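Dear colleagues,

For the upcoming journal club I promised to circulate an example of a predicted protein-ligand complex. I picked one with FE3-S4 cluster because it came up in last month's discussion. The inputs are reproduced below in full, followed by the predicted structure.
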Amino acid sequence: MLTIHVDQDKCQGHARCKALAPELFDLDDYGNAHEKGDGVVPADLIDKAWLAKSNCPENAIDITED
Ligand code: F3S
């Protein structure tokens, strides 16, 4: 059981998360990312989740595990 969170404070709109996991993130008009509706990570996107997290230069992405 995974969900994804973007910390707006840390986020500087690099947009790596979006490029890697389009299904998981949306950017606002100003370039910042935020989790898509559900937030829950589908089984086929679990690797892209950790990948986006690993890839954020600002360490702005959080993944919770239950
Ligand atoms: S800085 Fe922001 S746009 Fe994505 S890659 Fe990191 S959360």
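Two points we might discuss: The beta strands are 2-6, 25-27, 33-35, 61-65. The domain at 1-66 is CATH 3.30.70.20 (Alpha-Beta Plaits).

See you all on Thursday,
B. R.
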